[PDB]
């Protein structure tokens, strides 16, 4: 339990050893989730990179937020991927947010408070519970096989993961700075560990 | 009666089975009408899609709001259509509303509160009374013949239909959120039914 | 001419020298009028005060919006007054405004968008054209005889006056913030002058 | 005499029969004039069209406000014309107003409150009095010879014509909506006549 | 320098020894100021207490935010006091903020984002620079003479003092949690000192 | 002596007879000056033109503000000129202001309140005392030799000439409208003379 | 000691004699530093130029803020250089400044308050103490060898050097105008010396 308020992780150089793991105290399978966070990187025009990696035993790409080169964010559940295209690119800390529900397959997506159209992905799926979370590397296995081309170089922080779908009002509250309380991955009581060259510095985004 | 406030229908996948019907129990022909509604989709740059379909026995496209690819909205009365060109495209929940009158043929059109140039269409026509309304599919018959290419993928809600022409002040009130009361198709007294995969979710637009 | 958008006048102390005059370039008698404006003061529980004063040569109280103590607003035309009772009092920027017509004498009244019952006052009257408008003081003459007990201490702004009756839709538009264009006293082209301790400050009400 | 406040003419289709006449009660030659009017059309990118036509006996193009294709408005007095070039085009109700003075030849021009550079045209001219005004058609004779390609399709209203030069303050007052009093062509006491399919509808512009 | 984010001071018992001093690095006299701060106490119904005390050499009550028993907050400048009455009392962390300008004497007041009417106080005054700030005690001298009856028992934090007047939008951002940067008394770089039984604990208000 | 406030000169046609002369009552040579004024023309996309011409006996181009075509303003002192690049052009009344000091050669330049980079020109020069000022024509001699291609067509006014370097805050007050008092060429006490077609009209810029 | 508030240095011409020297009273090696300053020049589109030059005995390019042509600013430490590209260019007084720490090699970058992505540079380096600072010239030796092509022509001022890393809040305070106190190079007690044609003039940026 460590309060990471106003602090964010820093990935200055690309390497297959700089990464952090996150421990989820949840012991029940997931029927719905909502995981989003802040990040600031410059690789949005040079090569692809991962943002949030959630890999389990039977699947190395259970939940993976990946940024496709010249397309945009590529969200995926269980292995099937959907594309959220963007015709332009900016240089600023982006705060995207997405949700998912197995009961209806709706996949919401937000970009800096602006919402995107809902899509279907893995209707009736069942996300596991015992899994490993890696921020900065796209693991192709349960805790390893990091891709140098898919690695992340920049800043990252304010990770929050729920176990249900958040209303638009709750998403606006998260984007603005209002009070909240996660139940799966709390940024105020995160239980993480540092591996490689991962330094903690104050956040740049307000 | 079912109150659909703050809720909207969602269409994540294109299909000829995902659609809803709207009951119009009015037993009097229509000499004028006005319908405003919200919609949020990204198909404005890939292929055409339908928005509002009002089909009767003698005509499948009595009142039909269609989005033509690379031109814009294509409103039609009785079968003859007019074009409202838009040189650019945006990514945001758009709120359109149009009017029509048989006594003068004037066809108004509003896009997010901004008015468009008036046009003449079907002077002296007589819209029927008994009809079927379908949101998301272009029905080429009385309750069937849905086109997969003309289907809709996105969100839709707050559909309200009157039986006369609304003043510009009334249209501004509708766009802002002020009080109102439709007399043909009320979003607060909608009598609808679910067919296919059509779920109710909170609206994204404020 | 001076654009007074987002700005309002302030009266911090009660005095017979702090007041502002408003020049109406109209040269035609008025058979109907409608003026709406904002005001925020705390004198609603200690003593009476004036809000909108419109005095002419033959009558010092042609159009005068006064707040009577322990009853409410006291609107008057030509000298005859009517009472709009309020059993309670609030502490917030209140937006009230009324209308009047000589053809029928109907006097509407609105309080923060909520309408009041219509009343009759001065059926067949003829409001003069050459007159002086004073905001903050109850003038008992053509530009003088200011009452210290009836003076105003607080804020005032967004004064807009028409020469006809506004529909409920236009009233709701004014209350919400939609576009409009006054034709008697425009807040965007107000031709006023400062006298006494009257400072310009940003408005508190949204 | 008919009050045309908040109402405007509608030209939905192009034709040589759709036009309106305006009766000027002035019986004295004109040494200066100023006309402001609203108009909302979509023909600003397809073909030219007329806005204000003032033709007399000895000249069919005494005063003619014409919109040239791909350049802009082409104002003219007596027969000699000058060009007010616009490098871009918009889609919104535009409010133009221009002035002229025979004593100095100065030709002012305003576009939505923004002024244009002054120019000279017909120094020492003398505009006649007995003439016919046509809104929507470019007449090539005294009350006839309407051009099909030079027709107007859209809305028009709030036409006011003075007999002198208006100060920039008065022009801003007109643009914002403030009080005024014409003496040659009053929109509040217009004496007009209808011909063809010309319907009166509430204005779209605020 | 010490960052006091998410932390607040605690005054559990009334004593003439428990207080905190604040060092202002400003060496220029003040013509305007604005102090927003949080506080949560229960003495709002038992006896009076001080909130913000700013005393100098020539005046022991230069700037003093005091809560009068059964009346409300009693703001004062230089020695002249003004009353902001409130007929109701609540038990919750209240966020008040006030401003002042020597050029106009206007003194604003905000209570949990809700604004109060503006008043005049000490027009043309000049607040000194070399002074001592004490939170929790009403000092009757330059660093002493604390009143046990006027002492404070509760929590206080997030004190921020500017050197000018804040706009309503800035006050709204302060109350909500938006970014800001003080120039006289920064809660993120407070240079304070502890005295007596004053412990730092996480804040209760969100 | 005459007040030229709120009025500006008008040049409707290009001619070698339209110009205005200004008498400077100063009988001492100039070591520094500051000259700025308002102007509104459309020639900035067709051909070059002069703005402010200050010619003396020994030099026809002592101080001359010229607008080069496809580059921008070309300031000069004594005969040596410099270039101020503007990669774009606008259609609006532009208010530039520049200064110069012989003791350091520094020449400043402002554009509608926005400042430009500092440069050096004629270090140690000595501007003469007796001269003729011509607005609208580029004189190649002491009161003659006007170039038709370098003439000015548009409006001009607000001419002010100091005899030293003005501070940035003074430039800001000049651009906004604050009080000032020239000592060489006052717009409130200008002693000018008319020649050609030069009419006085109210200014368009606020 | 000299207070250089509201004043800035001016380099009007490129030359090998115009430069300013800065004396650092620090006698301890630097493990972290932070330089912030203002600058306004027009050479950002013609050729490269230096901004901040910090050369030592064993290294002529220890700390050098250089603007590379058609890419952007090129910060370097010890000899290794990293490029901060900018796809566009502006004409305005720009305020950029960076930080650095040898403990982890993290290097920040801010552009008018907007932060840039963090990078690694010279992990474990040790910046010397006895060095010479030159503003306007890129010294290739300890106090000489200035490049004419790399010289600076424009304005510069408000130079402040710390000996640690500044928080984002402190950076925002510096950018806004709040108080601060350097410990190695204070703009309020700068110990400099003039050489060549370097004149002091009031700053243009607010
Ligand atoms: Ca994988
Ligand atoms: Ca991989
Ligand atoms: Ca059909
Ligand atoms: Ca079909
Ligand atoms: Ca009276
Ligand atoms: Ca009285
Ligand atoms: Ca003709
Ligand atoms: Ca023709
Ligand atoms: Ca005291
Ligand atoms: Ca006491
Ligand atoms: Ca010459
Ligand atoms: Ca020449
Ligand atoms: Ca070097
Ligand atoms: Ca070099």
Residue numbers in the entry:
A (entry chain B), B (entry chain A), C (entry chain F), D (entry chain E), E (entry chain G), F (entry chain D), ...: 1 to 206
Question: What's written in the study?
Answer:
In this study, the effect of physical and chemical factors on the orientations of macromolecules was investigated through an analysis of selected well studied macromolecules, and important parameters that determine the behaviour of proteins on cryo-EM grids were revealed. The test proteins used in the analysis include human C-reactive protein (CRP) pentamer, CRP decamer, human erythrocyte catalase, SARS-CoV-2 spike protein, E. coli PaaZ and E. coli β-galactosidase. We performed a comprehensive examination of how macromolecule orientations respond to alterations in physical factors, such as freezing temperature, and chemical factors, such as the addition of surfactants or the presence of affinity tags, during grid freezing for a standard set of proteins. Hence, electrostatic interactions at the AWI are an important factor in determining protein orientations in the absence of any additive.
CRP exists in a concentration-dependent equilibrium between a pentamer and a decamer of a 25 kDa polypeptide under physiological conditions. In the concentration range used for cryo-EM experiments, both pentamer and decamer populations were observed in the same micrograph and were analysed separately. C5 symmetry was applied to the smaller pentameric molecule and no symmetry was applied to the decamer during image processing. The CRP decamer and SARS-CoV-2 spike had a more severe orientation bias, with more than 90% abundance of the preferred view, whereas in the case of the CRP pentamer the abundance was 50% and in catalase it was near 60%. The negatively charged B-face of CRP in the absence of additive is less sampled in the case of the CRP pentamer and is not sampled at all in the CRP decamer. However, this scenario does not seem to be applicable to CRP, as both the pentamer and decamer populations adopt preferred orientations in the absence of additives, indicating their interaction with the AWI. The orientations observed in this case look similar and the resulting reconstructions from 256 289 and 204 354 particles for the pentamer and decamer (C5 and C1 symmetry) resulted in resolutions of 3.2 and 2.8 Å, respectively. In comparison, we have obtained a 3.3 Å resolution map for the pentamer and a 4 Å resolution map for the decamer by averaging 25 000 and 51 000 particles, respectively.
